[PDB]
Design a binder for this molecule. Structure first.
Ligand SMILES: Nc1ncnc2c1ncn2[C@@H]1O[C@H](COP(=O)(O)OP(=O)(O)O)[C@@H](O)[C@H]1O
Ligand SMILES: Nc1ncnc2c1ncn2[C@@H]1O[C@H](COP(=O)(O)OP(=O)(O)O)[C@@H](O)[C@H]1O
Ligand SMILES: Nc1ncnc2c1ncn2[C@@H]1O[C@H](COP(=O)(O)OP(=O)(O)O)[C@@H](O)[C@H]1O
Lengths: 27, 52, 49, 440, 427, 435
């Protein structure tokens, strides 16, 4: 079910995104 | 008779062992504001103990 | 050889060979007072004086 | 439930208190003269003394030999050890025959061992000292005991341990709020881990998490193990120790699996005699059943009637289906039962008689009752008839296929036509031999 | 404690006098005076033990007391003297040759006893003080006659802590090696029970002197010596019988070193006996090797039981008496056991039934002797135990003639079994 | 000690002639003077592959002469006794057993120098270096003669750690093999405590480092085994304990190659000397046809030693063939490569002297009447049986209280113990009663 498809393999080769910067101390 | 009298009283590092922790349990149900269920894990980005 | 065969019965002893310096001889003569687990004392013929 | 075997119907010898045999008690019908004969050796076995005996159930193939030989085990109960071994299991490729025989001999011998141990368990609450004056010059005050609070599902109790136990605690590195196991006879302490009542929400640390320690903080219960002498033999021969590279050879199949008499006498027997005279273990001398003993060779027989004279051996029950036959291993030496005369003159013989039509009919009825078959009175009579011609084995084996044919033809009881059709669909030894002789 | 009474558990030794004169029914054995006297002569030569590699052959009818005489010799020889009993069929191994198995059997009945005078210290620990800064301490050892103090060293404290010895404990200290051995708990060893204690087995404190010099003895067989010297795996004596020691320096070196030890007075010799029961199982190769294995100076004495007569030798087609080739038969001294008469069979049955604790009547003895003279003495003997069970079942006191007759009709001997084998019986 | 303790030589004169009665032997003049030629041929160290066959009925002194040859040769040459049944090994090839026996039947005496470091160690400092393992180890060895700081290998340091040594104790070190023993802590420290779990040994004497020469002796088979199943050191080769660990099943490629090369290199440089011995193979009649056939090449090889077989059968079927018979149970192919030597059957007179010698060797004071009665006993029975009867008679005499063996003692002993022929007759009389 999770076999990497060539479509997704080609799609992933794009601009990445930065990780989040979390600082919550609330509910 | 036969007894044991181990002694280390020349220093405080020995006497400090017995009162080391004596602490109770305070992990409690971290109810989440979504379903009010047995909270499972804290989200690393929102620091909220979510369950669902 | 005498020391080799005496140290096997579980006993302590000391040497007085001619090669020993006079200070060592004096130290051993002093240690020969109130000896622990020591009954026999080794000596020589020429240097025994 | 389990599979229905060929001897799942026998449950005992069915003998009266006076030593007489009943008609059809304990699933065994007839066979009075042999069932009483073997009930005698049953009482012999019960009398743990007077060992080193052998009894030979001899007779035609399949009369009652294996049936009553393993019904001896049911009469004796599972408590006493009963080791079965067919005569073909002696030939091995990694160990010698006279060694397989010795293993089976002192494997049939059991040894049950009792031991009482006190046990502690409970999430520890806190540890504190018991201060006392200095036993020597004023270098400081000493400690006499350590008070430890253990909480369980029943209640929380405080207990005093010695300074050695506190040093063991320190070198074990446990803290306040974990699960510990303590014993007074030995003094060792085990760290089980954190309790489930303090279970985490996410933490993944796996330690076989200890649940709530249900039960008292102190519990005493007797352990009763059932170990055989061959178990001790194999354990001392190939020990499963720790990091002792002599033991790290477990990666090998390890042929050359024979034992040594030096050990067998000086190491394993002394430790058993000591336990017996101390009151820790009770010896359970047992039975060694050997069917098809005729398969053994001259060397095996010579070793058998040297070991049987040993004061330690268990009681042996040989079985024989052959008549005047040649002794295996020899060129041409004919002796009764395929067993040498020297061994035959050392074992008691019991002749298993042959069955009559009525007795075979009762046996067929019992086997049908055991297999859950609803055979009718006509099918039963026909089976009896066609089993008087052939052997009892073939007569009683025609109950599963007959029942299948009945169920397929829409029946709930084996009828006459079903068994008549099965008897023509399948043949027996003599019928097959006739066709073989007719053909080339 | 519980070691059942086997077939040969009734004989406690040869019933001989100081002059090796066999008594009629003394010490378990009955009749067989000539063979018992021969057994006694060979046993005296054994206990002397200045001649090596002597063979005796006890031949005779089946069930006439050959293995009985062998067990009697074993018992009369007792411990402190190797006695190895082996059946002729036990040497046919799959991992070692027949000659190697015979060499093992021989060298297993040769004992080497090293006598040592290692001094020790035996007393009841009173106090074990030790201060960790290398830790240093003292010990107070008490015996019923005196008390003393000892300054404990580093390794001494290490071993004491490892053995976990405490006060009130009675211990022995090998001063040469420092080996500690606690023998028990003295009355003082009472721990003032206020905690989880479950041991109160006290014992008297050691008596005599504090630092006494006792004598130890280490007795191991040439077999064990060569086995533990074969390879680094010095546990084959218990681990498993995997063997095959080359006849290179290993065994020759064992022999040469034992010779030097005997010469210098370290451990000289204690010869032994090898009882080969049913020797007719041995092969022609086995006999041919024994021919010269009996010629070695480290060869213990051997006694071989024989039932066969003029019969082919195993592994060939040579007819020879005893099933043994004359080549080996020439080295042996042959002792023939005669069949027991009526009064001998009766006395043997009486001793056996009194050993297995079964009271038989005067007519029970008569009928049993009749059965044992018409059939095998072994069958007559086995009848006793079976007859006692019917009596116990009917709640009797002593076995009568009717119980023995019921048992005779119930169980069959070989002759009656053969005569009942009138049908094909799947020949 | 019996059955060989009376023979201590062939008892031959300076001219190689057999003496009537000497060196524990009597009679067999021809056989003994012929075995003299064999001992001379063995001591010559000039031939190889020669074989002799001492042939005769049982108890005719063939094995006695075989051991007398060894006694004459002395303990300097390897005398390998072997039984024909030994070839049937379950771990190595049947021919491998025979070839390794032939190889060990040859000797080699070699003088070797070896060095030794010893002395009361003052300190042991491990000189560390980045690779990040220990680089070297400086040990200060003190002795009654002097003192020396010496640099040793990390392997020797690890061996010391295994020994669990500490500064101030006494150790024995060897550089050739690399093994280090802990003789115990110096005697000067025995006063440190009242009792310790320590062995004490005084200060080693002499030089700290000393080279000594030893004239050892080893057989070619010893080198063969040392090179086939090597142990050595400096590695984890101890896995030998589980690798295969049977008899190594040696191979010709190295049996006849590297070993011969290295031993010739040692010999031709004055370090070693070849010492060919004797291979006495008793009971050769149970050898298989395969062994008999390999013996052809074994004896036709230029390195095989002097072999001595013992024949006891007249004419029987050869083992392994089952259908063919030959004299001595040996095929005529091998029987043509041996020098047969008869062993005459003993007469009453010679047997009487043999019994006398055996009695005087077994510490037995037998009277003349008892000796002469043993003459009749031996003329009616076998020599071996008549001589075996001796010791029981001495025990019976000791029991009766007499200081000498009389007629009645030997009579009682003979009546108690039967002979082979008497037992065979008893069995023939009781034919259908012994099974
Ligand atoms: N007295 C009996 N009562 C009931 N079934 C019997 C009786 N005797 C024999 N049988 C049956 O006969 C079958 C074969 O007997 P078995 O023990 O195999 O004898 P053998 O080994 O001689 O063939 C067994 O499955 C058993 O169920
Ligand atoms: N002289 C004797 N005294 C007492 N019991 C004897 C005597 N001879 C034989 N027996 C008994 O006879 C039984 C069988 O005889 P055994 O000694 O085995 O002779 P064999 O070895 O020839 O069969 C043994 O249990 C033994 O106790
Ligand atoms: N020439 C001899 N002088 C003294 N004793 C002898 C002589 N020859 C043989 N014997 C004795 O005969 C016994 C058996 O002789 P043995 O050497 O075994 O003959 P074989 O080698 O043919 O079997 C030996 O124990 C030895 O004591």
């Amino acid at each position: 079910r999770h076999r990497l498809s060539r479509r997704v393999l080609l799609e992933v080769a794009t601009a990445p995104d930065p990780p989040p910067r979390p600082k919550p101390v609330k509910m | 008779c036969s007894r044991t009298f181990i002694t280390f009283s020349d220093d405080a590092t020995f006497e400090e062992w017995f009162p080391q922790g004596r602490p109770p349990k305070v992990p409690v149900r971290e109810v989440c504001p979504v379903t009010h269920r047995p909270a499972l894990y804290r989200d690393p980005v929102t620091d909220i103990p979510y369950a669902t | 050889v005498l020391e080799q065969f005496l140290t096997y019965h579980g006993h302590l002893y000391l040497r007085l060979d001619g090669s020993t310096r006079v200070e060592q001889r004096q130290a051993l003569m002093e240690r020969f007072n109130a000896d622990k687990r020591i009954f026999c004392f080794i000596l020589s013929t020429r240097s025994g004086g | 439930t389990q599979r229905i075997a060929s001897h799942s119907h026998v449950k005992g010898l069915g003998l009266d208190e006076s030593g007489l045999a009943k008609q059809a008690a304990s699933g065994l019908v007839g066979q009075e003269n042999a069932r009483e004969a073997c009930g005698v050796i049953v009482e012999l076995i019960k009398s743990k003394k007077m060992a080193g005996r052998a009894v030979l159930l001899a007779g035609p193939p399949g009369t009652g030999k294996t049936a009553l030989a393993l019904a001896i085990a049911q009469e004796l109960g599972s408590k006493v050890p009963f080791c079965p071994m067919v005569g073909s299991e002696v030939y091995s490729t990694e160990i010698k025959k006279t060694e397989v025989l010795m293993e089976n001999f002192r494997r049939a011998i059991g040894l049950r061992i009792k031991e009482t141990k006190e046990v502690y368990e409970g999430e520890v609450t806190e540890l504190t000292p018991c201060e006392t004056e200095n036993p020597m010059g004023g270098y400081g005050k000493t400690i006499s005991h350590v008070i430890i609070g253990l909480k369980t599902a029943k209640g929380t109790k405080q207990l005093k341990l010695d300074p050695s136990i506190f040093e063991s605690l320190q070198k074990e590195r446990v803290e306040a709020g974990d699960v510990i196991y303590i014993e007074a006879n030995s003094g060792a302490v085990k760290r089980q881990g954190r309790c489930d009542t303090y279970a985490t929400e996410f933490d993944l640390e796996a330690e076989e998490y200890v649940p709530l320690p249900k039960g008292d903080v102190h519990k005493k219960k007797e352990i009763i193990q059932d170990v055989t002498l061959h178990d001790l033999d194999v354990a001392n021969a190939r020990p499963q120790g720790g990091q002792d590279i002599l033991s790290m050879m477990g990666q090998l199949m390890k042929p050359k699996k024979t034992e040594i008499t030096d050990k067998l006498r000086g190491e394993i027997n002394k430790v058993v005699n000591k336990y017996i005279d101390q009151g820790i273990a009770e010896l359970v001398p047992g039975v060694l059943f050997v069917d098809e003993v005729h398969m053994l060779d001259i060397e095996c027989f010579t070793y058998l009637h040297r070991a049987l004279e040993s004061s330690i051996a268990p009681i042996v029950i040989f079985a024989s289906n052959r008549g005047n036959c040649v002794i295996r291993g020899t060129e041409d030496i004919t002796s009764p039962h395929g067993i040498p005369l020297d061994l035959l003159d050392r074992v008691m013989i019991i002749r298993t008689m042959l069955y009559t039509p009525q007795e075979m009919k009762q046996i067929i009825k019992i086997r049908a009752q055991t297999e859950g078959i609803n055979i009718s009175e006509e099918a039963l009579n026909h089976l009896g008839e066609i089993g008087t011609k052939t052997t009892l084995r073939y007569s009683v084996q025609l109950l599963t296929p007959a029942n299948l044919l009945a169920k397929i033809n829409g029946k709930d009881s084996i009828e006459k036509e079903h068994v008549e059709e099965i008897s023509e669909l399948f043949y027996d030894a003599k019928s097959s031999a006739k066709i073989l002789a007719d053909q080339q | 404690r519980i070691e059942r009474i086997g077939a040969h558990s009734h004989i406690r030794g040869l019933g001989l006098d100081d002059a090796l004169e066999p008594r009629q029914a003394s010490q378990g054995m009955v009749g067989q005076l000539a063979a018992r006297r021969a057994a006694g002569v060979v046993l005296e030569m054994i206990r002397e033990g200045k001649i090596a590699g002597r063979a005796v052959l006890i031949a005779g009818q089946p069930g006439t007391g050959k293995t009985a005489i062998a067990m009697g010799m074993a018992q009369a020889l007792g411990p402190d003297t190797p006695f190895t009993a082996i059946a002729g069929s036990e040497i046919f191994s799959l991992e070692m040759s027949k000659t190697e198995a015979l060499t093992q059997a021989f060298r297993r009945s040769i004992g080497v006893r090293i006598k040592e005078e290692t001094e020790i210290i035996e007393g009841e620990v009173v106090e074990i003080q030790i201060d960790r800064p290398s830790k240093v301490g003292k010990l107070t050892l008490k015996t019923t006659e005196m008390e003393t103090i000892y300054d404990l060293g580093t390794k001494m404290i290490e071993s004491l802590t490892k053995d976990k010895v405490q006060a009130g404990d009675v211990i022995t200290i090998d001063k040469a090696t420092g080996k500690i051995s606690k023998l028990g708990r003295s009355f003082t060893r009472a721990r003032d029970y206020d905690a989880m204690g479950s041991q109160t087995k006290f014992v008297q404190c050691p008596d005599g002197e504090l630092q006494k010099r006792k004598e130890v003895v280490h007795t191991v067989s040439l077999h064990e010596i060569d086995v533990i010297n074969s390879r680094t795996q010095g546990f084959l004596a218990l681990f498993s019988g995997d063997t095959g020691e080359i006849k290179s320096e290993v065994r020759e070196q064992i022999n040469a070193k034992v010779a030097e030890w005997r010469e210098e007075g370290k451990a000289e010799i204690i010869p032994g006996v090898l009882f080969i029961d049913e020797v007719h199982m041995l092969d022609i190769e086995s006999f041919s090797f024994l021919n010269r294995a009996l010629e070695s100076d480290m060869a213990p004495v051997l006694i071989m039981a024989t039932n066969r007569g003029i019969t082919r030798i195993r592994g060939t087609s040579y007819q020879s008496p005893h099933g043994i080739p004359i080549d080996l038969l020439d080295r042996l001294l042959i002792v023939s056991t005669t069949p027991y008469s009526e009064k001998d069979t009766k006395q043997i049955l009486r001793i056996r039934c009194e050993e297995e604790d079964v009271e038989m009547s005067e007519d029970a003895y008569t009928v049993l002797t009749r059965i044992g003279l018409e059939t095998s003495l072994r069958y007559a003997i086995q009848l006793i135990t079976a007859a006692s069970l019917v009596c116990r079942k009917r709640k009797g006191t002593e076995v009568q003639v009717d119980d023995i007759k019921r048992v005779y009709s119930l169980f069959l001997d070989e002759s009656r079994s053969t005569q009942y084998m009138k049908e094909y019986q799947d020949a």
